[PDB]
Design an enzyme around this catalytic site. Structure first.
Site, PDB file in Angstrom:
ATOM      1  N   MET B  40      43.183  11.034 118.447  1.00 39.08           N
ATOM      2  CA  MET B  40      42.953  12.086 117.323  1.00 39.08           C
ATOM      3  C   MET B  40      42.361  13.072 117.618  1.00 39.08           C
ATOM      4  SD  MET B  40      44.147   9.911 113.360  1.00 39.08           S
ATOM      5  CE  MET B  40      42.724   9.009 113.254  1.00 39.08           C
ATOM      6  N   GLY B  46      33.554   5.374 122.057  1.00 40.31           N
ATOM      7  CA  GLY B  46      34.806   4.231 121.764  1.00 40.31           C
ATOM      8  C   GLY B  46      36.409   4.752 122.765  1.00 40.31           C
ATOM      9  N   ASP B  74      35.778  20.963 123.151  1.00 32.80           N
ATOM     10  CA  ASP B  74      34.561  19.421 123.173  1.00 32.80           C
ATOM     11  C   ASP B  74      35.156  18.557 123.737  1.00 32.80           C
ATOM     12  OD1 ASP B  74      32.823  16.906 121.488  1.00 32.80           O
ATOM     13  OD2 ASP B  74      32.057  18.778 123.495  1.00 32.80           O
ATOM     14  N   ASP B  75      36.321  18.338 123.030  1.00 36.33           N
ATOM     15  CA  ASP B  75      36.814  17.367 123.263  1.00 36.33           C
ATOM     16  C   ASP B  75      38.243  17.664 124.926  1.00 36.33           C
ATOM     17  OD1 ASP B  75      37.494  16.289 121.026  1.00 36.33           O
ATOM     18  OD2 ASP B  75      39.050  16.569 120.092  1.00 36.33           O
ATOM     19  N   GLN B  78      35.423  16.813 127.483  1.00 38.80           N
ATOM     20  CA  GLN B  78      35.243  15.144 127.935  1.00 38.80           C
ATOM     21  C   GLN B  78      35.980  14.838 128.631  1.00 38.80           C
ATOM     22  OE1 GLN B  78      33.143  12.944 125.173  1.00 38.80           O
ATOM     23  NE2 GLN B  78      33.532  14.825 123.486  1.00 38.80           N
ATOM     24  N   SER B 182      32.729   5.482 115.373  1.00 30.91           N
ATOM     25  CA  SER B 182      33.564   5.367 114.607  1.00 30.91           C
ATOM     26  C   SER B 182      32.985   7.047 113.861  1.00 30.91           C
ATOM     27  CB  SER B 182      34.047   5.382 113.537  1.00 30.91           C
ATOM     28  OG  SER B 182      34.843   5.522 112.794  1.00 30.91           O
ATOM     29  N   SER B 183      34.047   8.254 114.347  1.00 29.75           N
ATOM     30  CA  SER B 183      33.685   9.313 113.684  1.00 29.75           C
ATOM     31  C   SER B 183      33.172   9.683 112.782  1.00 29.75           C
ATOM     32  CB  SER B 183      34.002  10.724 113.613  1.00 29.75           C
ATOM     33  OG  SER B 183      35.970   9.756 112.852  1.00 29.75           O
TER      34      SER B 183
END
Ligand SMILES: CN(C)S(=O)(=O)c1ccsc1
Ligand SMILES: CN(C)S(=O)(=O)c1ccsc1
Ligand SMILES: CN(C)S(=O)(=O)c1ccsc1
Lengths: 280, 274
Positions: B40, B46, B74-75, B78, B182-183
């Site tokens: 998501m 993680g 940003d995702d 990565q 976890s976010s």
């Protein structure tokens, strides 16, 4: 598992047909799936013949009936003979145990169409149907899957399943095959006695009267069908409905659907309807 | 007809389902093994552990999907830094062009544990999982053990619908004190963040206490949670590994969920009874 081409190869284990199907597809054959309940008649043979005509096709015909835990015609030998005569090369005949080793656990939930028409009195019927169609599609991964228009609502729901889960398969609707007087071929026609078989022509007469009446508008088409069904002695109409082609309740093109009881035998039929200009 | 452009060794981003389906089918035909990592977005370590597990399969091409059910930059950076070649970033309307219509109905496990407060949550999840499997047609799909009950329900989906994909569960990545990543963690204030280590401490304590039996394990976990302030425990359950009832011994899983302020945290661990 062995695969003899140009002969009928019968597999009962899902893993067997899935392995055979995958191997055939890797070698260039296009896999065609015709899912059936068995008790095959010329309406099923029309699907087989449509599948066979795709070039490079290997035809898989599945035969399976859901278990009824809480009457359906079962003629297996005879089904396989018809298939051999059609030059089908794969019959898939899974057991109930192989299909439901965990009972009903994950299942398909159809959209709101499933609660209408055939689903009104049997709100879980199409969830049963679509769960097996999804499983058969995953086991066999056909290029194309073939269904009759006679079960039109089922066909629409299958196209919704394919669209909504992004299934990589093309759905081919095949026109209904009819007896010489118009009666739609069905495994259930054997349950009509001679009088009932005579009366049952009124479904197709009503529909084709309506399709021709429709130059006069939707109401005239509907009233022509009702009059013909009203003139038929032993026919008890469950529903007669004109819907748009995707079975939303209508523009220039529609589908007219009927369901009726002849004694205990419930019969369906349906037809394409063009309102006003053009058709007819 | 014509396959979309795919540049090997760069991050190729596709938003149209038909585009990623066509490129996945074409790469598979050239020999590559398609690995799918559904996410998501809001990626942290993680998620990159799932990516690294998918990357190590020989011949892999890694598809990472990013989708939230009704920074992108940003995702994507990565994933680029991880050597991922395919990102699939569909819109809501691309995934639901006809609205919510046909859906997956999970079995009864979906009404338990996380399904208590959120009784339709898993039907939503399994519907999107099934769509992504059909669009991408991966050889293996990677999920974190962090969401253990989800992972179990996905294995039920795949078995029950005869899906030809291998499901790979990847161990939870943890912060240095054991808190599972976890976010949601960044919402915790300092008091809440200090107390949150009680979830992992309780679970590990139970997994070592388990040589003394199931009840020792549970009582050790409930002691550690009882030592924490402001940790409202929603459940603490020991189950078999498929989340049925815990057998008299053998392998099981202990799951916990708790609320700290407005933040719900979850953790779980393998347990071996005696
Ligand atoms: C009573 N049903 C037909 S069933 O599917 O539960 C069954 C089948 C073999 S024994 C019971
Ligand atoms: C729609 N069918 C003919 S099927 O072969 O998917 C089926 C559905 C319930 S039993 C067999
Ligand atoms: C389980 N997920 C991480 S998924 O990508 O299949 C999903 C489910 C609801 S939104 C994304």
């Amino acid at each position: 598992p062995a695969f003899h081409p140009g002969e009928l190869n019968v597999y009962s284990a899902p893993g067997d047909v899935a392995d055979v199907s995958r191997a055939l597809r890797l070698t260039g054959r296009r896999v065609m799936l015709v899912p059936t309940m068995g008790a095959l008649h010329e309406g099923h043979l029309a699907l087989v013949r449509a599948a066979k005509r795709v070039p490079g096709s290997v035809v898989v015909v599945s035969i399976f009936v859901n278990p009824m835990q809480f009457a359906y015609p079962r003629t297996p030998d005879d089904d396989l003979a018809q298939l051999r005569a059609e030059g089908v090369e794969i019959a898939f005949t899974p057991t109930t145990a192989a299909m439901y080793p965990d009972g009903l656990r994950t299942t398909v939930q159809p959209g709101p169409l499933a609660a209408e028409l055939e689903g009104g009195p049997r709100p879980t019927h199409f969830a049963g149907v679509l769960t097996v169609v999804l499983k058969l599609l995953q086991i066999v991964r056909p290029d194309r899957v073939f269904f009759g228009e006679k079960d039109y609502q089922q066909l629409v729901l299958i196209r919704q399943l394919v669209a909504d889960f992004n299934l990589d398969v093309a759905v081919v609707g095949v026109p209904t095959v009819r007896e010489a007087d118009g009666l739609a071929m069905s495994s259930r026609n054997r349950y009509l006695d001679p009088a009932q078989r005579a009366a049952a022509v009124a479904l197709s007469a009503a529909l084709t009267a309506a399709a021709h009446a429709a130059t006069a508008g939707a109401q005239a088409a509907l009233d022509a069908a009702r009059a013909v069904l009203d003139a038929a002695p032993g026919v008890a109409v469950d529903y007669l409905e004109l819907r748009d082609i995707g079975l939303g309740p209508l523009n220039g093109s529609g589908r007219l659907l009927v369901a009726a009881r002849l004694g205990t035998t419930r019969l369906l039929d349906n037809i394409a309807i063009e309102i006003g200009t053009f058709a007819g």
